[PDB]
Structure formats: structure tokens, C-alpha cells
Amino acid sequence: PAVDTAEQVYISSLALLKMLKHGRAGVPMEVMGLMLGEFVDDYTVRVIDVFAMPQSGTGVSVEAVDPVFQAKMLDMLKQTGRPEMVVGWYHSHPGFGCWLSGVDINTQQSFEALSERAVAVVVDPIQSVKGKVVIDAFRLINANMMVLGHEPRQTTSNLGHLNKPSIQALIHGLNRHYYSITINYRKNELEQKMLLNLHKKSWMEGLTLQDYSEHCKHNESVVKEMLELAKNYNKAVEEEDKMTQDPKRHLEEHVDVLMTSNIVQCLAAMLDTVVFK
Amino acid sequence: DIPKGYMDLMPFINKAGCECLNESDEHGFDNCLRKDTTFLESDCDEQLLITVAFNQPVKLYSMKFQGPDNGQGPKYVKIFINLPRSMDFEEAERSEPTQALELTEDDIKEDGIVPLRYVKFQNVNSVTIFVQSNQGEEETTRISYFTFIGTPVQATNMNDFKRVVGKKGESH
Amino acid sequence: SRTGHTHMPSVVGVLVFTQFWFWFPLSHFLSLAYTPTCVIGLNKDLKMPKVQYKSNCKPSTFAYPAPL
Amino acid sequence: AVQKVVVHPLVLLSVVDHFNRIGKVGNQKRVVGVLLGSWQKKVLDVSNSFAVPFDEDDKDDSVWFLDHDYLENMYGMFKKVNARERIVGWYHTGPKLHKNDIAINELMKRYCPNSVLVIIDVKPKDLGLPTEAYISVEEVHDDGTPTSKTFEHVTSEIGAEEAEEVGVEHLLRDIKDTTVGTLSQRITNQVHGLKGLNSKLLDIRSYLEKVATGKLPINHQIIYQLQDVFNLLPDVSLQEFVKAFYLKTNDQMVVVYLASLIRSVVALHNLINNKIANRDAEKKEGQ
Amino acid sequence: LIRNNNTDLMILKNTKDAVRNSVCHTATVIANSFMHCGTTSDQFLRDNLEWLARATNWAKFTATASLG
Ligand SMILES: [Zn+2]
């Protein structure tokens, strides 16, 4: 048997948010938790929920699982509507990359022995600057796999080569002791709307005018800067036409900003004059 | 009967969770699980609500839920799965089933096997079966046999978590 | 085909072949889109007679690529 | 009391997930849970939640079994996980209140005297926030109308820590809206603002019609706020406002006109550059 | 196609020599399949059976379908 290079760990929206929150809720200590999910068949690992684990001093190791805690919370989740498995464990690496180091391989070996499909997800919450989420999923390579003359994981689809690995992980052996399974976040149509509500602008913000004093100051400043750019532009056009750009591009961006601001505020003003009387 | 690869889900049923609401004390739940002609009777009305629980999630291919052939047999079988709480004969009459079988005498007979929509039963821990109507119309309903045919889903049985490698002191 | 009719085996094969990005084994389906460029003469009783047709173009314009 | 309740995207997604994971296996309508968060002045910050088993009879409307033992154990576990978060109320995913709500709030007031019920509407509407927050108040009414234990609104908002913005941004990057004012987007924003104003005015009119015809009692607070709104309506026919409006409209349109002239000159310059490039190419090709 | 099977196996021999990965192994299996399509001549597979042993799992599928 082999693990295809199309396997994906579909991390749900709730799981991703919980992971990032727990990472920056305990940086620069490391944090750990379980990933309740579902092994669909052989190419899918669905991480439906994640599962914080109390900080226990011994970093993140096998002794940091606290069997009483996990058992009791799994029972309680079962009776509240989560009859889910334990597909792997996530554990943050606060700022020093997304890979594994020794104890991680030992712990993931424990999880695999429990069930040989459990992934291990690593999140770097400091490097997760807004606009880039650094999460990577991993699983081990059998000692009799790369030494017996077999590639770590077969390849039947062109899917597994659309993401390039990072040198940070290469150094620690992204391809000598463990894989890298793709993520492929799974978003419903309701979660996306509920999240859009985060920055959704109110009708008030749509229909509210801009402080006229500040608007006039902005008009004046932009028109002056545009005058300077226009003098430079005259000089540039004369010089280029004589001897045979930055002024033109800056002038274009500034004209854009002035026109958008003025038209928007003027139309808002008329709309209000009609709507509120 | 049993296509290769699928096995009867008797061994994975734990009595810790099995129950059957509205059952006559004369004929108990143990009757439906012997393959003998020992039956289960309805107590008050022409309705019944069985519930079976499995140790590890299982996949259900077919059901052998059959009764006698004297007009006292299940007619409308509503199957729900994975119920957080034991339900009542009032929710059983409106809740949308995961399956809505309407048995016929052919299925009722000893050689009748009713196949379910396999896809909706890919992870089953608890099954509640509501018999809403009898084959004809009898104040008491009777069930002669009931067993599921399917496959078990590989279990990640926590509490088995142990050090398979290394010392007992590494932290990170 | 050689008469303007859409060739169902060919279209189907090319589609399933393009679906190799997801499953390599399907790449074989392109075999369905291989029409032999042939002009086969048959005699009255559907037997194959020994004859030679003549082109009107340099052989190098339509000859096999040279054996490497 | 508490004026503001800022809910978090994790709370919202958790509620959605609870509703889905129970509705899939049954049909319960409501799903009920506890909210965990922290105070800062009179500004509640709901930053987590968890389901608590619930079951009620939709006929009797006074028989329900919110499970306080489960609540306590679950809160113990989350207290171990993170301690700067104490129970700050509850939530239920029902589009409207229910008779039980006051009794459930009385139950939860054991664990938080200042309880905030956030009715997180799973169904995605297109005009309002999905959270509406309430707090229980019993007090002798000033107008002498008989007093009963009923809810009072507490302003609600959605805000996020940076650790959650990094997630929401990534999840929504596919269908995101540029965080900059493109003129089309701004005109769209104003149209949506008019949509919303119309919706709110229709709501007010429907309520006033119901009040007038008598199907509802009169709420002096609502009448106060409405007549204050009318009080605040402005006047536009006033001369020294029409003068000022014309003055600033003209100033804005001078800026617009200068912008347009600059754009025209730049466009002509680019056209000349391209015509010269093509002329050179044609001449070189000819020679 | 049998009669006019004027194929050059030297190109495939060079490709095989250049094969290192299993992607390329199955790629060359498919390439031989194409090159011989219609031609009931499996000489490239018949004269290299050591090389048709590094394909395991979902590559033996492709090799057998290639005979097809
Ligand atoms: Zn680690």
C-alpha cells in the first residue's frame, strides 16, 4: 500500500480559527491539541473540530495528552453532537518555522500506532501575518520505506506537485522522515457569510458624508502635490522631446484619488439632500 | 444475503445502549436477536421505537428487520441515525428521517432484505427505528428479527495512547 | 470524420484524456482518438487487392521522420 | 449594566457548527450554549462559546432541560485550557425569543449575574449583523404599568483579534472586496445604504401601523426615539444652506474639472507616443 | 497498422535511460502505449522486464491498460 500524492487534510473554518487563536493564546510557549475529524476514505482527512489541551509544562509530548481530560471531553462532545474521531494532533511552533523536531516525530508515531492515518498539523502564529497562514500538515515515513527501495508516497495524479516546499522544512527533513499533505480549506456557504459580517460596512457608513473640513484639506493637499508633479511633467516632456514615467504615473494616481473622492462625496451629499427631506 | 466484504453488525452492538420504547414486558428486546421465531410486541399503540448503539462507528448496507405474516408486521419504518438524546413518539412523527422505508410483505418474509441508501449511513453510532404503521391495521405490532449488514469503520480508540518510542521525559 | 461528422469516440477520448490531471490511468483514453490516416482499396468481394496509388508531391513532404 | 457586546468570528462559526451538527442528526430548531468572554469597563468581549445539551417541549413552553452539570464540567475544562475567560451569558440559534428564555436566563444568572443572551441567527441576512444581545431587567416602571421580567437590548458588534483576522482574511480571500474605494464600489455602497434606510423605514412604519391599529401596546421608549428622529430631520429649503451647498459643490467640481483636464492631456500624450512608435515601426519595416 | 508499424524504438530507449522517477516510469509506459497504438507489437515491454518492475500499485494498472 501507499499514500497517494493527492491526499488532502480539509481543515474547516472553525478548526483553522481555533488553531490560530490557541497559537497566539500561548505564544511564546508552545500549545497542543487534538483534531477531531473523519477519515473519509484514502485521499481525505476532514478536520471538523480542534481540541485544546491544557498547558502541562512538558512542552508538547506524549505525556502532554492527559488521558482523563481527553476521554472526558470526548464523551461530553459525543453527547452534545460530536461523535467524531481523533484524526491527529496540532501543535504550534511559535515563530521558528513549520516543521517537526524529534519529540514531534515520537508523538506522531504514537498517534500513528493508535491509527496509521493521523496527520500532524503545525501552525506558526507569529509568521502568520495577516494575509498568509503558515500551516503545514505532516505524516511520517516508515523506516522500511525509503531504505527498502521505495518512494515515500506514490503519485497517480498531478495534484500533489502544485505546492512547493519551503527550505525551512527541507533543512529539518521535509522528505526524509515525513510527508507534507496539502490543506485545501473547506468552506460552506453559511460560514463565509457569517465571517463577511466581520467587516461588512453598515448602511450608515455607505450613506454618511465625509467631514467637509478634512475633505477640503485633502483636496488642497492633493492638488498642490499634483501641481508639483505637473511642473516636473512639463520639464520631463520638454526634455524628452528635445533629447529624442514617474511624473505621468504619479499624476495619474493623484487624479484618480481626487476624482473618486470628490464624486463620491458630492453624490452622497445630493442623495442625502433628497432622501432626508 | 451477505455480499462479500459486508458482515452482520451483531458483535458491535453493546447492550449498554440498546433500548426499545413501548414494548410489552412479556416479549423483550432480546427476542429480536436470535434468528429464532421469538418476537417483540408493542405495548400500547400500533407503533414502536427501537434504538441500537454500536461501540465503534459502522457502515450499514442492509437491514433484516422482519416480522410475522399475519397482518401484524411493520409497514412504515423511519430510520434516524446518531441521535444525541433518546427521542419520543412525538418527534418520531415529524422529524425528517435519514431513511423512510416502506416495507412490503416481500421484505417482511424470512427471505426479505431491505437495502438502505448506503451513502447516508457511512458513519453510524446509534440508530433509531420508528415503526409507524403495521402491515394492515393491528392494535399490536410484532417484530420477529432485526439485524444490520455492513462494515465497521476503523476506530481510533483513544485511551490506548502510549509511548511507542523514546524515553519518558522528552518535552520539546 | 472524413465527411464532417463529429467523431464521438474522439471527442470522448480527448475529454477523458484531459482528465489525467486527476487520474493518470485515464491517459490511455486518448487511444480512442487515433484514426488511421489510410486509403484502403477493396475489391468487389471485400478482399484487399494488390495495387499502388500515386501521389503528386515530393516524398520528403510526407515521409516518415528519419530514424534517429 | 453593560452597553456593548463585541462578539467574535470564532463564536459565530462555533454557533453555526453547533446548529448544523445537531440539525443534521435531528430537527431541534433551537440550539443552546454558553458564551465565554471577558469584561473591560462596560464592554463585554465574547471570545468563545460551547454547546450545552438542551431539550424543550415546543407545545407546553415551560418544560426544558438545560444541563447545568454539563455546563459546570465543560466550563471547568475550558478554564483549564484558558483562564482569562469566565461565563458571560448564553446564546441560542432561534430567530426569535421564546417563553423559556427568561427561565434559562435565571438559570444562567447563577454562573453570571450579568448575563447576556446573544440570539445568533444562523440564517444569513443581507442587511444586519447576525447577533442581537439582550439582558434581563426587572424594575418598577416609571409610568406605573404592571411590571414583569422582560429583556432589554444591549448594543452588539462584531470584532476580532488579530489572530482571528489572519484567519477570516485567508478564508474570505477568494470572494473578498478590495479594501479601497473604487468608484464603482463606493456608488455600490451608497446604493446599499439607501437599501438599508428603506428597510429600516419600512420596519418603523409597520410597527407604527400595528401600534395605531392596536395589535401591539405602545412603547414609550420607541415613541420617544421616533419623535426625536423627526426632531432631528434637517431643512434644505433654507437659503443659507442652499448657498453653502452650491458653493461647496462648485469647489468639488472645480477639482473634478482640473482632474479631467489633466487626464485628457495625459491621454493625448500617450496617443502621440503610440502613433510615433507605430510610425517608426512602419518606416523601419518599409526600409 | 501492423503492416506499416515503422516505429523507432531508439527514442524510447533514450527516454528509458533518462527515467529516474516513478512519474517518468509511468509516463514512458504511456508513451510506449501511444507509440504502438493499434500495432500489436509489445516489443518495448517484452525486451525490458526489469524496468517493468519498478512500477507498483497504480502504475501496474497503467502498464496492463497499456498492453490493452
Ligand atoms: Zn514540535
mmCIF file of C-alpha atoms and ligand atoms in Angstrom, chain A residues 30 60 89 91-93 96 99-101 103-104 122, chain B residues 172, ligand 1:
data_model
loop_
_atom_site.group_PDB
_atom_site.id
_atom_site.type_symbol
_atom_site.label_atom_id
_atom_site.label_comp_id
_atom_site.label_asym_id
_atom_site.label_seq_id
_atom_site.Cartn_x
_atom_site.Cartn_y
_atom_site.Cartn_z
ATOM 1 C CA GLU A 30 4.042 26.030 22.600
ATOM 2 C CA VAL A 60 4.148 19.162 23.805
ATOM 3 C CA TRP A 89 -2.837 16.462 16.708
ATOM 4 C CA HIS A 91 0.847 21.884 17.956
ATOM 5 C CA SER A 92 2.114 25.389 17.430
ATOM 6 C CA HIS A 93 5.720 26.354 16.720
ATOM 7 C CA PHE A 96 10.541 29.195 14.415
ATOM 8 C CA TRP A 99 8.247 21.531 10.586
ATOM 9 C CA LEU A 100 8.945 18.821 13.164
ATOM 10 C CA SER A 101 11.752 18.165 15.665
ATOM 11 C CA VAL A 103 9.652 14.833 20.050
ATOM 12 C CA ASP A 104 7.119 15.662 17.359
ATOM 13 C CA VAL A 122 1.935 22.724 12.646
ATOM 14 C CA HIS B 172 10.442 19.645 23.152
HETATM 15 ZN ZN ZN F 1 7.271 20.220 17.550
#
